[model samples]
Target: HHHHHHMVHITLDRNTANSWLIISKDRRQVRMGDTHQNVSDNKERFSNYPMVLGAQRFSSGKMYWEVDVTQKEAWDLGVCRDSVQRKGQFSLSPENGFWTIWLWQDSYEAGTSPQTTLHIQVPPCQIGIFVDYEAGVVSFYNITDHGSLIYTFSECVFAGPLRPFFNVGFNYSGGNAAPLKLCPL
Candidate 1:
């Protein structure tokens, strides 16, 4: 799905959704709902982890996507394996099949194993994620900084289909209610 730039269309996988998370009709936006639905649970549903996956899956080749995280105070964006545990509390580091960066309490940090603190003056209005499964590199860029490279996880290994992953906290109020929009670009 590469265009003039590396842009891929992705939709949140509703089956893997959290009860309190809402997927937009356009399938390009994910929001934190104030109320938790009585939706029945399934194997794909995240029990302890409040996360959703992308409909597009990747096992090889290069892939890229951008996420709009403006007006949000807490969120997590990155890639995870198809075999990642979906029902328990576990280390979310790349060693555990999660290669991501998180914004919590206004701080940004890459997941463990060479933990790196991201220095930033502004939030990623549009966070660009580039992944090369064969080469095993996951890099993040700040669009507002003119595609300035942020951080990267290199020499990683992909065992299977790695999907775009996201997470929003339980509480949506207090000015962190904006949906994480999947940019058309």
Candidate 2:
């Protein structure tokens, strides 16, 4: 029997400066929230609001996945799992089939925190994330950039299947506001 699995949907109202809503599969969980404040600082300005989904799991294997979202300033979404002491393997934007692995021991607070921010210039486009567990590598690519490889991490290892989550918002880094919508397939 092919069961129809329902996916969680998230929608952001561009009209509403900094507000977002999340709808669960069963329509039982409806979360409406907003960011504390727009990140406007030039150095650490994360004016882009980020909505993060809890992590999802992966099994021992290789996976190629991609997501399409309406473009905004610099929107980022990724997958990660819990590590001991908030210290686990993580790679944001991978490149060249390699990923940059980081140990939470370096910055446990910043590394494991849910609302932590990482900035990148990913215009409204379809983003692809590839993981090769056997090779112990993770990569992110810009599907619209002629498949231009963005970032990679080599030392990263899949302690287990990646319970991936997602985050989407806007980035006001001296430019007009651009908000993105997460459309999962």
Candidate 3:
């Protein structure tokens, strides 16, 4: 099979507003890949994985956001706005790979929930997913490790914000494909 990867280089400017940025293969502006099928409220859909590329470093607090990849089936991926909860946060793995990341929270069988609903103060990392259906895995990664495994979902799509602000110029990579740089307008 063909392995696809894309990247987006984002620079959070001083004027960037606090909002979630939705990225998908179809949505070129954001550049993040899209979700897969068989995503139900009971089974976790792709619309739930919305990500935010922070324009600035995130402070410690609580933030709530949502994304809809399919139609009415959207899921919620909340993060602690504060940097205090980073200590207990879990890293991504290859086992839980899915079309979306919401499965990390909603999939009762998967049991990959966020330890703390907060964005802790850690080094800046690129938060996204890697789907290899041929291998039967969908995983999330922190770009600092060259997209190292952060979390995995069996067959769900990634649909959640990265949090803070929507900075332009973030790159996204899928499968074994090269990163695609997304410059701000």
Candidate 4:
């Protein structure tokens, strides 16, 4: 069997980053900043949240990307509607335009309504997220040993456009010291 895969270079937009988020100069890695540098109070910045949005938006076509949260303590990675609220606290649910998988407290699970329990019995260093715009499906994959299916969200509808969203999470001093790197294409 052929393992088919696609590559996408996701651009991390610092303009939409939180005050404590340190986005690499190359615009790839998004991690907790060690210092509260003089980041202008951009209106798009997530004040009380640790997150950022991708520079690219998608309304069609299938796209694939991976994120490395290996040494992280807690994080959230997924897609959000282009118009999703950038200010204040919001739910990471589909109804709110955030479809994601959360890595925290030494576990990983999909961000679905009712919160499915993710029995990720392995240390998944590489996490793959695939989106089928037309299919209205988002799939998660992990590897305990072989290719393991993590979770899939179906019957999901995108308003118009969706951009990849990320957050190193609120685990601040606990498990978010590492940068959530987008795998190289």
For each candidate, the alpha-carbon lDDT, in order, equals: 0.83, 0.40, 0.29, 0.80
Model 1 ranges off by over 4 Å: 1-4
lDDT of 4: 0.80
What does candidate 4's lDDT look like per residue over 83-122, in tens digits?
A: 8887877778898888898876766767887677787778
Model 3 agreement with the true structure over 156-184: per-residue lDDT tens digits = 33232233222121223223122223322
RMSD of each: 2.2, 11.4, 17.2, 2.0
lDDT of 1: 0.83
Per-residue lDDT over 59-156 for candidate 1, one digit per residue giving the tens place of the 0 to 100 score: 88888898998888888899999888888787678778999998878789898666679997666788889998888999888887777777888888
Off by over 4 Å in 4: 1-4, 143-145
| Candidate 4 lDDT for residue 13 | 88
lDDT (C-alpha) at residue 57 in model 2: 48
Per-residue lDDT tens digits for candidate 2, residues 2-72, read 11132333333222222343444542222324435332333211123443333344555665555564323
Using alpha carbons, what is the TM-score of model 3? 0.27
Model 1 residue 31 CA deviation (Å) reads 1.2
- By lDDT, the candidates rank as 1, 4, 2, 3
Residue 90 lDDT in model 2? 37
- Residue-level error in angstroms, candidate 3, position 160: 21
TM-score of each: 0.92, 0.47, 0.27, 0.91
Instruction: Provide the lDDT at 125 for model 3.
Output: 26
